[PDB]
RNA sequence: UUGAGAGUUUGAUCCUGGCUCAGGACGAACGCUGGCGGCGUGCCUAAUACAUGCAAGUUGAGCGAUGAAGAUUGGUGCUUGCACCAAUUUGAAGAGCAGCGAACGGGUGAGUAACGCGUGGGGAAUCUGCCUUUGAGCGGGGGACAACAUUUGGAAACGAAUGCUAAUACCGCAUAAUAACUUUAAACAUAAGUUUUAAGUUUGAAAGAUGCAAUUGCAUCACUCAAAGAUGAUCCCGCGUUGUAUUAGCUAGUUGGUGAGGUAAAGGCUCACCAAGGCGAUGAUACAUAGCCGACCUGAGAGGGUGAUCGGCCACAUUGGGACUGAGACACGGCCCAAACUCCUACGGGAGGCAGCAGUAGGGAAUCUUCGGCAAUGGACGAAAGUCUGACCGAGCAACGCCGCGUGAGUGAAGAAGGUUUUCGGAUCGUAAAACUCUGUUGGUAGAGAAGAACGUUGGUGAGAGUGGAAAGCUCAUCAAGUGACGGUAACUACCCAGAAAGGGACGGCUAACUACGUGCCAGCAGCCGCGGUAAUACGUAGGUCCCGAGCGUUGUCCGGAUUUAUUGGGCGUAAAGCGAGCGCAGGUGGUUUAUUAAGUCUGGUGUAAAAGGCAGUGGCUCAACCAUUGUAUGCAUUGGAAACUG
RNA sequence: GAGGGCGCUUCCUAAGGUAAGACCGAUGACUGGGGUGAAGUCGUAACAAGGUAGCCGUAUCGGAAGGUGCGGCUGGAUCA
C-alpha cells in the first residue's frame, strides 16, 4: 500500500496490454500449411520475449493442436 | 518454616537426628490434652507418623520432599529403599551434622545457608546441596570464627561414619554413603512411599 | 437464569445483605436437605461482609484474617 | 535458494544457537530441513558440534552460511578445500 | 505399472472401466482378528473383454479419467462363467 | 509393567447393584495470606467493532532532476573583499522512471467430517528464479513516456491536455537448433507404450554495470537456457483420520466414449457431441459437530481424555465472488465488483477494514505495556556500505504455574510471668524459648568491580584460481577494526541489627487433631452417613491440636478407582436379561489325511517423529527445578527365508 | 494493411427478488399425562389361602382403587 499499487497497475496494465497483443496473435487462425505462417503461429510464444511470458511447456501445449495439423 | 517440635518431641517422644535431642518431661501435647490421656493410631496413623518423623524431624519441606522423593522413587532395581534412605545424607547440613559440629541440622543449615562456609567457590545459599561422595567441603575461616559457631559448631564433638573429619578446618569428605546397614530409624517405604507416592 | 432453569440456589450463612439487581456468584453445590436445588451461592464474595475468627477458615461468609 | 544459519535456543541470558541448513523461505525457528551441529560462541568458549560432511553436500548443492557459520568454515578449512577443488 | 490388487468385478458391463472386490483382512484393535473388507476400483478395460469370474490387475499410472484411478490392464486370473 | 477404599437399601448377612470419595493435572477463578530470586507461561473467551503507534523495501555501480557546493576562478562590489560574477560537482532528502521480496515475517481456527490431516509410492501427469553451475552471447535498431515541460479541472479525492529525456524499461527483427515440433530408422517399448540417431522451424541481452587496466583483455549479474543437482511446490492412489440408519433409496455431467479448450500436466480438469449408467442397507446421500497430526494430562498398563502454548500441514483474511500480474497469490496490509459499517461531502463524489504486534471499546475467570533497538540473529534488496523487521532479542504486568532459600540459629524448659482447661493439682511456650551467645538466606547501606552476552562484512598483509594478465578484482589462510538493551546486570567485599521478611486450611466420623462452648431441630454446618430439640469434638464460640506453604482451601473441567459395556477385564434360572417359536439369505465357524502355496503367520534388509518428547549421560541460569547437549529407545517401511498352524 | 484500447453482443456470473416446500429453534389461549408436597375427602383392595391368591395378553363395564369373562402359569395356598 506504499507503491505496490503501482507495482500492480503498471505491470498488469503493460503486459495485459501485451496479452491484447497476444490474443489475435494466437487467433486469426486459418489452417495455412505455410512455413512462414507456422513461423508466425509457432512464434506466438516468442513475440515480445521479455514481457512475452515465454512459459514452461506453454509452447508445447500450444503445439499439441498447433502441431496437430499445423497446416 | 522453622516450626517447633511438639510433634516430633511430643507426639513421638523422640526428636530424632534432624535435631537429635530427647526432650524432657511432659511428653504429651500440652496446654489442652497435656494432663489428659493418650490416643491411638492406625496404618494410616503410621504412614502419617513415619512421614512426619522422617520429614518433619529434619527440616525438609513437603514440596521439595515429595518432588525430590518421587525423584527418590525413580529407579526400579527391586528394593528402592536404599535409594530412598541413601538420599537422607546428601544434604550438606546433614553432612556437617554427621561431622558432629552443628548441634542440629538446622544449625548447619542456618550458618551454612548464610554464605559463611564457602564450599568450593560459591556463596552457599542451599544447605540441601546434593552431595556427591569423595569431595571436600571448603570451610571459610570467618565462619570458623563466628561466635555462634565458636560456641557450638567449632565446639568440636564426635563424628559419624562415611566421611573424613578435618577437626582443624572443620571439614569433611563423603567416603561411602550411609544406608540401612548404617542408619536405622523405623524407615518404611510402605509408610512414606505408600503415604505419598500414589498411595498404593 | 437466562437459560430457563431454577429460580433458586442456596445462600449459606446467617443473614445476607443483597437485594434485587445484585450480581450473584454461583457455587456449584448440592444439598439433599434442600429441595429443588442444583446450585449454591458463593457467600464470602465481593458483595459479602461477615464476622471473622470463624472456626472454619475465619474468612468465608464475608470475612478476612482480622486486622485486629 | 539454499542457506545455512544458526538457531536461537536458550535462556534469557544463556542463549544457544544450533546450525541448520535452510533457505530464504525457511523459518529460522519453525519449519526446517535438518540441523547440522549445535553452537555456543562465548561460553565456554568457541563451543561447536561439527561434522564437515553435509556442509559439503549442501555446497555441492550450494548453500549460504551465516556470519559465524562462514567464519566457522574458515575455522574449518573446507573453504581451503574449495581452494582444493579450485 | 507398479502395484497390484485382485478380486471379482461387480459390474462386467461398462466400457473401459470395471471394478474389483477386495478380500483384505485388517485388524480390529479390540477384537484382534483381521477382518475382510471390500474396496472397489473401477478402471481400464482393454477391449471390454468382461467376464463373470475373471480377475484383472491394476497399474499405478496416469488415471484414465474421472473415477478410473489405476489402469486395470492385465487379466491374470481367468475363470469360466459357471 | 502394575492394582487399597470409604459411607451407603443394613431387624441381621451375602450377592447383583447404583450412589459417595481420596490422587493428580488445569492458558481457571474466588475468601485469606500475598517475601525474595531464578525458570517458564497467560482473550481456552464475541473470525465483536476499532480513533491510538509500528509492522517490506532497496539501491544515485542506469537515469531525469531541485538544493548545497558557492565545488568562489571569472568586476570574485570595495563593505577593506565578497551583495555578486555565483568554476561545476561532496552534484543536497539527492524526489520519480528500474528490481527484488510483493506468496516474507506474523497471527486466527471462523469454517472445514475428507486426498484436508499423518505415513507410502509416482510423475509411465509435473514446475521451480532466488543457490551450486552447462553450452552461452551479452546482436539488433526504433519509439511515447514517469520526472520535467506543463495547462487545468475538481469541495476534496483524484485525474486530464502538453512534448521530451532516461532506462540497471519496452519492442520488431537475422544470430539460439538436443527447448517444442517439423525428420527418417529403430536397439527398447508396457492397455497405454518408453527410448538413440538418421530432414526441416521460433527467437537473446543491462553491445549494460562498476571498474580494471592491458599477450587490451579480467571479475558481480537477465533475457542466451540449459547441464544436472538442489530447494520449494503440483496432483493421483494405499493406509487410519466424529455422531445421528427415528442419518433410504441416492445420483443429471451423474457415469462411460469421442473431440476440443486448458494445465506444469493424463484427467467432464472443463466444454461440445454420442452413449445410461453408477452408488447404496457390510451405511450412499442429508443433519449436527470437528481444524488435523506429532504431541500432551491421567490411568500400572490397556487405555481414557485434550489438541493448549511448541513444531508440521490445512484453512482464513468485515462479508461474498471474480480475475490480471507475479516462476509461484486468487494475495492480512494487490486490484475490481457487490453488500455492511464508518468518515468527509457545498450531496455533485471519495476512502477503509487490528483473526499482525501493540493498544482501545465491548464480554467474561481471562491484563501481558499504547517501552527500546535490531548489535544476538532472521529476511529483503543494495557491488559493498547501507537500509528496514511489534520477527526476534530484551525490559515492564499476572503467585498464573515450577523450583529454590527464608523470616532466625545454638545453649538454656521451670510449667515457667503468660494464656487456657481445671476434680484446683497439672498443663501450653519444646529449644528465639523469659532470658543468654552469636549470625547475615532474602533484603540494609557503601559500593570495588560493574557479565563474556561480540562474528566479520571495513582496510592491510600473505596463499590459491594464479584468473592471455602480476594487474585490479575474486576465492578466504592473518592482523587492525565497532561488535550493548537488560548495566555498574547476576556474581563479590564491607553485612546491618535478630533486627525488615511465613500464614492458610482442617478437628463427629468419612482419614489422623477434642474440651470451655450461647445453644436447644435454634440459628447454622455438610461430598456420603448427616446433623443441632439443654451441657453438640458436627454448629457460633476460645484453647489445644491435624496437614501444608508463599501458597492454603473452594468449586468449574478431565482421568483413575469404575471390571460402571467387563478384548485385556462381564452377566443372562429367580436379583437386568434367552427373541414367541421355525426357516436357511448373507455372514460366521470348520471330520481326518497327501502335497503345493507363504496369503496371514515368524526371521533378516528397507521406510520412522527435521524436531521437540521418554531411558541414560553430560554441562549449566548455580546445585536448584528445569534448560542446553549427547546418544539410546519406534507396523511408520519394504524385502530373502520357514511349510509347523490357518487360509 | 496487421494488431491495438475503445469500438461491441453473448457466455458463466457475486448479490437481490420470486415460489413451494422441508428441517430446526423460539413461541402459544386452553389442554393431556407424570412427579412433588397435606396431614382433605372416596374406598378396599395388593400384601397371610391379606381377606374373591393371583400374574399375564386380550375384550369389556366401572369416580376410583377395581370388577366380569376368554385362555395360560405359580412368581399359590389347607394341601388338594
PDB file of N, CA and C in Angstrom, chain B residues 81-147:
ATOM      1  N   UNK B  81      14.368 -48.828  48.473  1.00  0.00           N
ATOM      2  CA  UNK B  81      14.507 -48.153  49.756  1.00  0.00           C
ATOM      3  C   UNK B  81      15.923 -47.750  50.101  1.00  0.00           C
ATOM      4  N   UNK B  82      16.911 -48.438  49.528  1.00  0.00           N
ATOM      5  CA  UNK B  82      18.285 -47.967  49.627  1.00  0.00           C
ATOM      6  C   UNK B  82      18.455 -46.652  48.893  1.00  0.00           C
ATOM      7  N   UNK B  83      17.823 -46.518  47.733  1.00  0.00           N
ATOM      8  CA  UNK B  83      17.876 -45.254  47.022  1.00  0.00           C
ATOM      9  C   UNK B  83      17.027 -44.193  47.699  1.00  0.00           C
ATOM     10  N   UNK B  84      16.043 -44.596  48.506  1.00  0.00           N
ATOM     11  CA  UNK B  84      15.303 -43.621  49.298  1.00  0.00           C
ATOM     12  C   UNK B  84      16.141 -43.103  50.455  1.00  0.00           C
ATOM     13  N   UNK B  85      16.508 -43.987  51.378  1.00  0.00           N
ATOM     14  CA  UNK B  85      17.157 -43.527  52.594  1.00  0.00           C
ATOM     15  C   UNK B  85      18.629 -43.206  52.392  1.00  0.00           C
ATOM     16  N   UNK B  86      19.211 -43.622  51.267  1.00  0.00           N
ATOM     17  CA  UNK B  86      20.550 -43.171  50.902  1.00  0.00           C
ATOM     18  C   UNK B  86      20.555 -41.671  50.640  1.00  0.00           C
ATOM     19  N   UNK B  87      19.475 -41.155  50.068  1.00  0.00           N
ATOM     20  CA  UNK B  87      19.326 -39.711  49.920  1.00  0.00           C
ATOM     21  C   UNK B  87      18.677 -39.093  51.154  1.00  0.00           C
ATOM     22  N   UNK B  88      19.208 -39.437  52.322  1.00  0.00           N
ATOM     23  CA  UNK B  88      18.963 -38.691  53.542  1.00  0.00           C
ATOM     24  C   UNK B  88      20.194 -37.960  54.029  1.00  0.00           C
ATOM     25  N   UNK B  89      21.373 -38.362  53.565  1.00  0.00           N
ATOM     26  CA  UNK B  89      22.615 -37.726  53.966  1.00  0.00           C
ATOM     27  C   UNK B  89      23.085 -36.686  52.962  1.00  0.00           C
ATOM     28  N   UNK B  90      22.595 -36.739  51.722  1.00  0.00           N
ATOM     29  CA  UNK B  90      23.122 -35.915  50.640  1.00  0.00           C
ATOM     30  C   UNK B  90      22.708 -34.446  50.727  1.00  0.00           C
ATOM     31  N   UNK B  91      22.176 -33.987  51.852  1.00  0.00           N
ATOM     32  CA  UNK B  91      22.028 -32.570  52.141  1.00  0.00           C
ATOM     33  C   UNK B  91      23.176 -32.157  53.055  1.00  0.00           C
ATOM     34  N   UNK B  92      23.727 -30.964  52.803  1.00  0.00           N
ATOM     35  CA  UNK B  92      25.027 -30.582  53.359  1.00  0.00           C
ATOM     36  C   UNK B  92      24.964 -30.347  54.864  1.00  0.00           C
ATOM     37  N   UNK B  93      23.840 -29.819  55.357  1.00  0.00           N
ATOM     38  CA  UNK B  93      23.658 -29.647  56.795  1.00  0.00           C
ATOM     39  C   UNK B  93      23.601 -30.983  57.526  1.00  0.00           C
ATOM     40  N   UNK B  94      23.135 -32.031  56.846  1.00  0.00           N
ATOM     41  CA  UNK B  94      23.238 -33.369  57.406  1.00  0.00           C
ATOM     42  C   UNK B  94      24.675 -33.870  57.361  1.00  0.00           C
ATOM     43  N   UNK B  95      25.467 -33.415  56.388  1.00  0.00           N
ATOM     44  CA  UNK B  95      26.852 -33.868  56.296  1.00  0.00           C
ATOM     45  C   UNK B  95      27.683 -33.272  57.427  1.00  0.00           C
ATOM     46  N   UNK B  96      27.533 -31.968  57.673  1.00  0.00           N
ATOM     47  CA  UNK B  96      28.182 -31.339  58.823  1.00  0.00           C
ATOM     48  C   UNK B  96      27.567 -31.847  60.122  1.00  0.00           C
ATOM     49  N   UNK B  97      26.273 -32.164  60.088  1.00  0.00           N
ATOM     50  CA  UNK B  97      25.607 -32.719  61.256  1.00  0.00           C
ATOM     51  C   UNK B  97      26.147 -34.098  61.615  1.00  0.00           C
ATOM     52  N   UNK B  98      26.593 -34.863  60.624  1.00  0.00           N
ATOM     53  CA  UNK B  98      27.283 -36.115  60.883  1.00  0.00           C
ATOM     54  C   UNK B  98      28.789 -35.940  60.983  1.00  0.00           C
ATOM     55  N   UNK B  99      29.303 -34.741  60.710  1.00  0.00           N
ATOM     56  CA  UNK B  99      30.601 -34.363  61.245  1.00  0.00           C
ATOM     57  C   UNK B  99      30.509 -34.050  62.727  1.00  0.00           C
ATOM     58  N   UNK B 100      29.296 -33.826  63.234  1.00  0.00           N
ATOM     59  CA  UNK B 100      29.077 -33.673  64.654  1.00  0.00           C
ATOM     60  C   UNK B 100      29.325 -32.283  65.168  1.00  0.00           C
ATOM     61  N   UNK B 101      29.588 -31.333  64.277  1.00  0.00           N
ATOM     62  CA  UNK B 101      29.948 -29.988  64.694  1.00  0.00           C
ATOM     63  C   UNK B 101      28.711 -29.186  65.082  1.00  0.00           C
ATOM     64  N   UNK B 102      27.751 -29.073  64.168  1.00  0.00           N
ATOM     65  CA  UNK B 102      26.499 -28.399  64.476  1.00  0.00           C
ATOM     66  C   UNK B 102      25.647 -29.253  65.407  1.00  0.00           C
ATOM     67  N   UNK B 103      24.902 -28.574  66.288  1.00  0.00           N
ATOM     68  CA  UNK B 103      24.052 -29.268  67.253  1.00  0.00           C
ATOM     69  C   UNK B 103      22.915 -29.992  66.552  1.00  0.00           C
ATOM     70  N   UNK B 104      22.230 -29.294  65.660  1.00  0.00           N
ATOM     71  CA  UNK B 104      21.199 -29.853  64.808  1.00  0.00           C
ATOM     72  C   UNK B 104      21.561 -29.612  63.351  1.00  0.00           C
ATOM     73  N   UNK B 105      20.786 -30.236  62.463  1.00  0.00           N
ATOM     74  CA  UNK B 105      20.920 -29.927  61.047  1.00  0.00           C
ATOM     75  C   UNK B 105      20.445 -28.514  60.755  1.00  0.00           C
ATOM     76  N   UNK B 106      19.544 -27.986  61.587  1.00  0.00           N
ATOM     77  CA  UNK B 106      19.061 -26.624  61.428  1.00  0.00           C
ATOM     78  C   UNK B 106      20.150 -25.602  61.723  1.00  0.00           C
ATOM     79  N   UNK B 107      21.164 -25.977  62.500  1.00  0.00           N
ATOM     80  CA  UNK B 107      22.239 -25.042  62.794  1.00  0.00           C
ATOM     81  C   UNK B 107      23.210 -24.938  61.628  1.00  0.00           C
ATOM     82  N   UNK B 108      23.618 -26.085  61.080  1.00  0.00           N
ATOM     83  CA  UNK B 108      24.433 -26.080  59.875  1.00  0.00           C
ATOM     84  C   UNK B 108      23.654 -25.545  58.684  1.00  0.00           C
ATOM     85  N   UNK B 109      22.337 -25.738  58.666  1.00  0.00           N
ATOM     86  CA  UNK B 109      21.541 -25.120  57.617  1.00  0.00           C
ATOM     87  C   UNK B 109      21.478 -23.610  57.792  1.00  0.00           C
ATOM     88  N   UNK B 110      21.435 -23.130  59.035  1.00  0.00           N
ATOM     89  CA  UNK B 110      21.484 -21.701  59.307  1.00  0.00           C
ATOM     90  C   UNK B 110      22.802 -21.111  58.843  1.00  0.00           C
ATOM     91  N   UNK B 111      23.880 -21.513  59.493  1.00  0.00           N
ATOM     92  CA  UNK B 111      25.151 -20.841  59.326  1.00  0.00           C
ATOM     93  C   UNK B 111      25.977 -21.440  58.203  1.00  0.00           C
ATOM     94  N   UNK B 112      25.393 -22.338  57.417  1.00  0.00           N
ATOM     95  CA  UNK B 112      25.923 -22.705  56.111  1.00  0.00           C
ATOM     96  C   UNK B 112      25.081 -21.963  55.083  1.00  0.00           C
ATOM     97  N   UNK B 113      23.800 -21.763  55.406  1.00  0.00           N
ATOM     98  CA  UNK B 113      22.915 -21.050  54.494  1.00  0.00           C
ATOM     99  C   UNK B 113      23.277 -19.577  54.398  1.00  0.00           C
ATOM    100  N   UNK B 114      23.813 -18.987  55.472  1.00  0.00           N
ATOM    101  CA  UNK B 114      24.191 -17.572  55.470  1.00  0.00           C
ATOM    102  C   UNK B 114      25.306 -17.207  54.487  1.00  0.00           C
ATOM    103  N   UNK B 115      25.910 -18.168  53.795  1.00  0.00           N
ATOM    104  CA  UNK B 115      27.058 -17.863  52.971  1.00  0.00           C
ATOM    105  C   UNK B 115      28.323 -17.724  53.777  1.00  0.00           C
ATOM    106  N   UNK B 116      28.355 -18.315  54.966  1.00  0.00           N
ATOM    107  CA  UNK B 116      29.550 -18.297  55.809  1.00  0.00           C
ATOM    108  C   UNK B 116      30.570 -19.282  55.252  1.00  0.00           C
ATOM    109  N   UNK B 117      30.226 -20.563  55.275  1.00  0.00           N
ATOM    110  CA  UNK B 117      31.100 -21.606  54.759  1.00  0.00           C
ATOM    111  C   UNK B 117      30.996 -21.615  53.243  1.00  0.00           C
ATOM    112  N   UNK B 118      32.108 -21.332  52.579  1.00  0.00           N
ATOM    113  CA  UNK B 118      32.143 -21.202  51.127  1.00  0.00           C
ATOM    114  C   UNK B 118      32.618 -22.538  50.572  1.00  0.00           C
ATOM    115  N   UNK B 119      31.670 -23.424  50.274  1.00  0.00           N
ATOM    116  CA  UNK B 119      32.019 -24.764  49.823  1.00  0.00           C
ATOM    117  C   UNK B 119      32.424 -24.696  48.358  1.00  0.00           C
ATOM    118  N   UNK B 120      33.737 -24.598  48.122  1.00  0.00           N
ATOM    119  CA  UNK B 120      34.370 -24.619  46.795  1.00  0.00           C
ATOM    120  C   UNK B 120      33.855 -23.504  45.879  1.00  0.00           C
ATOM    121  N   UNK B 121      34.114 -22.266  46.294  1.00  0.00           N
ATOM    122  CA  UNK B 121      33.951 -21.126  45.411  1.00  0.00           C
ATOM    123  C   UNK B 121      32.534 -20.686  45.128  1.00  0.00           C
ATOM    124  N   UNK B 122      31.597 -20.956  46.032  1.00  0.00           N
ATOM    125  CA  UNK B 122      30.221 -20.500  45.883  1.00  0.00           C
ATOM    126  C   UNK B 122      29.704 -20.050  47.237  1.00  0.00           C
ATOM    127  N   UNK B 123      29.105 -18.860  47.276  1.00  0.00           N
ATOM    128  CA  UNK B 123      28.456 -18.364  48.486  1.00  0.00           C
ATOM    129  C   UNK B 123      27.229 -19.228  48.727  1.00  0.00           C
ATOM    130  N   UNK B 124      27.332 -20.119  49.709  1.00  0.00           N
ATOM    131  CA  UNK B 124      26.388 -21.221  49.852  1.00  0.00           C
ATOM    132  C   UNK B 124      25.071 -20.682  50.393  1.00  0.00           C
ATOM    133  N   UNK B 125      24.023 -20.800  49.587  1.00  0.00           N
ATOM    134  CA  UNK B 125      22.677 -20.448  49.988  1.00  0.00           C
ATOM    135  C   UNK B 125      21.707 -21.618  49.885  1.00  0.00           C
ATOM    136  N   UNK B 126      22.199 -22.828  49.628  1.00  0.00           N
ATOM    137  CA  UNK B 126      21.405 -24.048  49.773  1.00  0.00           C
ATOM    138  C   UNK B 126      22.207 -25.074  50.566  1.00  0.00           C
ATOM    139  N   UNK B 127      21.845 -25.333  51.823  1.00  0.00           N
ATOM    140  CA  UNK B 127      22.442 -26.453  52.558  1.00  0.00           C
ATOM    141  C   UNK B 127      21.856 -27.807  52.202  1.00  0.00           C
ATOM    142  N   UNK B 128      20.833 -27.866  51.350  1.00  0.00           N
ATOM    143  CA  UNK B 128      20.406 -29.122  50.752  1.00  0.00           C
ATOM    144  C   UNK B 128      21.034 -29.320  49.381  1.00  0.00           C
ATOM    145  N   UNK B 129      22.232 -28.761  49.191  1.00  0.00           N
ATOM    146  CA  UNK B 129      23.073 -29.073  48.045  1.00  0.00           C
ATOM    147  C   UNK B 129      23.309 -30.568  47.972  1.00  0.00           C
ATOM    148  N   UNK B 130      22.997 -31.154  46.823  1.00  0.00           N
ATOM    149  CA  UNK B 130      23.019 -32.602  46.691  1.00  0.00           C
ATOM    150  C   UNK B 130      24.452 -33.104  46.635  1.00  0.00           C
ATOM    151  N   UNK B 131      24.824 -33.867  47.652  1.00  0.00           N
ATOM    152  CA  UNK B 131      26.210 -34.228  47.905  1.00  0.00           C
ATOM    153  C   UNK B 131      26.552 -35.480  47.110  1.00  0.00           C
ATOM    154  N   UNK B 132      27.696 -35.447  46.429  1.00  0.00           N
ATOM    155  CA  UNK B 132      28.458 -36.472  45.735  1.00  0.00           C
ATOM    156  C   UNK B 132      29.629 -36.928  46.598  1.00  0.00           C
ATOM    157  N   UNK B 133      29.944 -38.220  46.624  1.00  0.00           N
ATOM    158  CA  UNK B 133      30.980 -38.711  47.537  1.00  0.00           C
ATOM    159  C   UNK B 133      32.384 -38.384  47.057  1.00  0.00           C
ATOM    160  N   UNK B 134      33.322 -38.473  47.996  1.00  0.00           N
ATOM    161  CA  UNK B 134      34.720 -38.257  47.699  1.00  0.00           C
ATOM    162  C   UNK B 134      35.116 -36.824  47.433  1.00  0.00           C
ATOM    163  N   UNK B 135      34.283 -35.854  47.796  1.00  0.00           N
ATOM    164  CA  UNK B 135      34.599 -34.451  47.593  1.00  0.00           C
ATOM    165  C   UNK B 135      34.753 -33.743  48.930  1.00  0.00           C
ATOM    166  N   UNK B 136      35.653 -32.765  48.955  1.00  0.00           N
ATOM    167  CA  UNK B 136      35.935 -31.994  50.158  1.00  0.00           C
ATOM    168  C   UNK B 136      34.881 -30.910  50.328  1.00  0.00           C
ATOM    169  N   UNK B 137      34.844 -30.297  51.507  1.00  0.00           N
ATOM    170  CA  UNK B 137      33.900 -29.230  51.828  1.00  0.00           C
ATOM    171  C   UNK B 137      34.734 -28.080  52.375  1.00  0.00           C
ATOM    172  N   UNK B 138      34.976 -27.063  51.551  1.00  0.00           N
ATOM    173  CA  UNK B 138      35.848 -25.968  51.952  1.00  0.00           C
ATOM    174  C   UNK B 138      35.116 -25.041  52.914  1.00  0.00           C
ATOM    175  N   UNK B 139      35.757 -24.741  54.042  1.00  0.00           N
ATOM    176  CA  UNK B 139      35.144 -24.013  55.148  1.00  0.00           C
ATOM    177  C   UNK B 139      35.923 -22.724  55.370  1.00  0.00           C
ATOM    178  N   UNK B 140      35.214 -21.599  55.347  1.00  0.00           N
ATOM    179  CA  UNK B 140      35.825 -20.286  55.492  1.00  0.00           C
ATOM    180  C   UNK B 140      36.215 -20.022  56.945  1.00  0.00           C
ATOM    181  N   UNK B 141      37.335 -19.316  57.122  1.00  0.00           N
ATOM    182  CA  UNK B 141      37.838 -19.039  58.462  1.00  0.00           C
ATOM    183  C   UNK B 141      36.966 -18.026  59.194  1.00  0.00           C
ATOM    184  N   UNK B 142      36.312 -17.120  58.454  1.00  0.00           N
ATOM    185  CA  UNK B 142      35.333 -16.219  59.055  1.00  0.00           C
ATOM    186  C   UNK B 142      34.199 -17.005  59.692  1.00  0.00           C
ATOM    187  N   UNK B 143      33.733 -18.044  58.996  1.00  0.00           N
ATOM    188  CA  UNK B 143      32.772 -18.971  59.576  1.00  0.00           C
ATOM    189  C   UNK B 143      33.377 -19.712  60.753  1.00  0.00           C
ATOM    190  N   UNK B 144      34.652 -20.082  60.648  1.00  0.00           N
ATOM    191  CA  UNK B 144      35.335 -20.748  61.746  1.00  0.00           C
ATOM    192  C   UNK B 144      35.534 -19.855  62.962  1.00  0.00           C
ATOM    193  N   UNK B 145      35.370 -18.538  62.822  1.00  0.00           N
ATOM    194  CA  UNK B 145      35.435 -17.622  63.952  1.00  0.00           C
ATOM    195  C   UNK B 145      34.113 -16.893  64.181  1.00  0.00           C
ATOM    196  N   UNK B 146      33.026 -17.374  63.582  1.00  0.00           N
ATOM    197  CA  UNK B 146      31.689 -16.948  64.024  1.00  0.00           C
ATOM    198  C   UNK B 146      31.471 -17.392  65.466  1.00  0.00           C
ATOM    199  N   UNK B 147      31.119 -16.485  66.383  1.00  0.00           N
ATOM    200  CA  UNK B 147      30.980 -16.875  67.798  1.00  0.00           C
ATOM    201  C   UNK B 147      29.795 -17.782  68.099  1.00  0.00           C
TER     202      UNK B 147
END
